[PDB]
């Protein structure tokens, strides 16, 4: 581990310092189908005509990123993405830009979102949830070691691959920060109290978010929900959680620690670091080595029927790609 991460820091640092740019053109890909949508872009199943491969291309409208004041965050995204390398993060294959947008051609993860299966299935058994937790545990342990904060953990951002393993996408709020940070970021249901409480924060928010994840997986719903975010924030900062009667005692106690308002008492943030979690009773059966190697029995395998099969994703209206005769936000994005 410490040795592993040690070697790991070095490749990221090289990449951090000399981030890559413009590794392709639009016309080398064949646009096939929107897999997801968002405030200022859509992810598309795309086909590389020279290789006959499929990727997920993220298309960011430059003007809309500017209107929404998301330039830095967008920059962090591409820079951190091309620099990292772990078995549970999606691979950035290319990036380029045109007069009108920014592109990130990532690897097409066929299994669909975790969100989708969990919604349909209802709730996951502890063992099935634990399979997935362990994978975010290591992923955070890697991420944090590089002074990165993930900041957007939710079922919608975790994808399942052919082998029933996790693939974390969306690094739109990922930030390399040594010391506290202040942006109100994320999804309401997953915000740590410090964040809603405008009090500057660190990595500890990633362990509270994980505490929420495990809860939504095992019980089928978030520990704090209401109809409007203000009502949710209120619950989050109250520090009052009710646990489903079907939660094991070990799970109830992992969750009490992970969802600790007092961040000088919150697991992951303590003296012994990430070991407090990796050594918790709930996890006693987990073989972290076997899991990092992808040699564990995957509890569920979404099966798909061939390349380009997009039946694990919901349908979205197709908006048409428009690329201006005039370069749009040159200076703002020159480092992209």
């Amino acid at each position: 581990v410490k040795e592993f991460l040690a070697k790991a820091k070095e490749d990221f640092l090289k990449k951090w310092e000399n981030p890559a740019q413009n590794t392709a053109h639009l016309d080398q890909f064949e646009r096939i189908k929107t897999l997801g949508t968002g405030s200022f872009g859509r992810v598309m199943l795309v086909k590389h005509m020279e290789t006959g491969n499929h990727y997920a291309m993220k298309i960011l409208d430059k003007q809309k990123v500017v209107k929404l004041k998301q330039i830095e965050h967008t920059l962090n995204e591409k820079r951190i993405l091309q620099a990292v390398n772990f078995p549970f993060l999606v691979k950035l294959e290319f990036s380029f830009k045109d007069n009108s947008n920014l592109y990130m051609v990532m690897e097409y993860v066929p299994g669909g979102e975790m969100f989708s299966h969990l919604r349909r299935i209802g709730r996951f058994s502890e063992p099935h949830a634990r399979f997935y937790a362990a994978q975010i545990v290591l992923t955070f342990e890697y991420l944090h070691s590089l002074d990165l904060i993930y900041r957007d953990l939710k079922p919608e951002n975790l994808l399942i691959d052919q082998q029933g393993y996790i693939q974390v996408t969306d690094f739109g709020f990922a930030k390399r920060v040594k010391g506290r940070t202040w942006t109100l970021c994320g999804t309401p249901e997953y915000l740590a109290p410090e964040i809603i409480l405008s009090k500057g924060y660190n990595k500890a928010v990633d362990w509270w978010a994980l505490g929420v994840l495990i809860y939504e997986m095992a019980a089928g719903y978030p520990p704090f929900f209401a109809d409007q975010p203000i009502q949710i924030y209120e619950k989050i900062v109250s520090g009052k959680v009710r646990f489903p009667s079907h939660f094991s005692s070990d799970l109830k106690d992992l969750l009490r620690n992970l969802l600790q308002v007092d961040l000088t008492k919150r697991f992951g943030n303590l003296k012994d670091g990430v070991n407090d979690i990796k050594n918790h009773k709930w996890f006693a059966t987990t073989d972290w080595i076997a899991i990092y190697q992808r040699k564990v029995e995957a509890p569920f395998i979404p099966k798909f029927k061939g390349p380009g099969d997009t039946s694990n994703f919901d349908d979205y209206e197709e908006e048409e790609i428009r690329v201006s005769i005039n370069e749009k936000c040159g200076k703002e994005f020159s480092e992209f």
């Binding site: 004041k69 969100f115 739109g172 109100l184 089928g220 929900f225 109809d227 409007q228 975010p229 489903p244």
Partner: peptide, 20 residues
């Protein structure tokens, strides 16, 4: 039930990220 209470609610679908 909390499950019932959850399905009847407004945030059962894909949750969006809070920017500004």
């Amino acid at each position: 039930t909390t499950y019932a209470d959850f399905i009847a609610s407004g945030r059962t679908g894909r949750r969006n990220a809070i920017h500004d």
